[PDB]
Structure 1
Amino acid sequence: VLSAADKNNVKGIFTKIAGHAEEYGAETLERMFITYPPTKTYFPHFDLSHGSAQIKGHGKKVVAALIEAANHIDDIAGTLSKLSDLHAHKLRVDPVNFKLLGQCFLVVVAIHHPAALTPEVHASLDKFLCAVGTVLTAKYR
């Protein structure tokens, strides 16, 4: 699973994101909603006009959930379990989408921290995100 290098690389850039949750959160979702349109279908309650409260507010949520799985990293399922029931049983988020958000968040970090997102770091971060995608898809599996 998440190796010493993984569990340290992933904290690496996540400590370099911090006072940037709301900013990095919302930019990921916008890139998601535009680079991939059909992902907006999960947000009809939502105003998806650029930099709108609910994108910014919930982007702030997503990262607080990303960064909080990065701190309680031994039990990644234990810290984000409540968002499995939600994403998997209630909202029936297709797994093909966690991939797509992953891509987007990764694109954020490589915009504001290119030097930080080295091949090695990219790779740990992929595993973590994909450890997260996998958890929130669990309310079947």
Structure 2
Amino acid sequence: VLSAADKTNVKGVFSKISGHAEEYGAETLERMFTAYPQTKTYFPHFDLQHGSAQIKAHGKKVVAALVEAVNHIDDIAGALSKLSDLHAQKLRVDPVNFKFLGHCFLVVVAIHHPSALTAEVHASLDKFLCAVGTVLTAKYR
């Protein structure tokens, strides 16, 4: 349910990552395809080799979507309604996959901005990822 402090905590860590979208979204796709190989099944068409340029590019587009829901955090569904149709309806992604993606993202922010990631920002960032997950899977429920 994002409280006022959650919203702020999220904004807070996104300022430190708003500057490196492409290196951060690529790294998160790479750990996702490496720790959870079953997610590679959704990108049959991409080159999935470390540093492929399709990973960098998609990486960059995955975190701008994030930044954009940070920005409209008050109505994440409304700001992301075209992505919800793509993933639920067109792509049909299984919901479990969003938790794999969300976790590889926390893992990038702890490796790179540890101190930003306290236990309470940790909790705000998780409810956020989870809100995005739910909106992107919403034409399922």
- Cα deviation for residue 140 of structure 1 reads 1.9
Residues matched between the structures, number: 141
- Cα deviation for residue 139 of structure 1 reads 1.2
- CA distance in structure 2 between the partners assigned to 1:74 and 1:14 by the alignment: 16
- Cα deviation for residue 78 of structure 1 reads 0.6
CA distances 1:9-57 after superposition (whole Å, capped 9, x unpaired): 0011101101200010000000000001000000001000001111000
1:82-121 to structure 2, matched below 5 A, reads 82-121=82-121
Q: Structure 1 regions of 5+ residues with no counterpart?
A: none
Residue aligned with 2:4, SS: coil
Amino acid at match of 1:128: F
Amino acid at match of 2:50: H
Equivalent residue number for residue 10 of structure 1: 10
TM-score by length of 2: 0.99
TM-score by length of 1: 0.99
Amino acid at match of 2:130: C
Percent identity between matched residues is 88
- CA distance in structure 1 between the partners assigned to 2:18 and 2:69 by the alignment: 14
- CA distance in structure 1 between the partners assigned to 2:80 and 2:120 by the alignment: 25
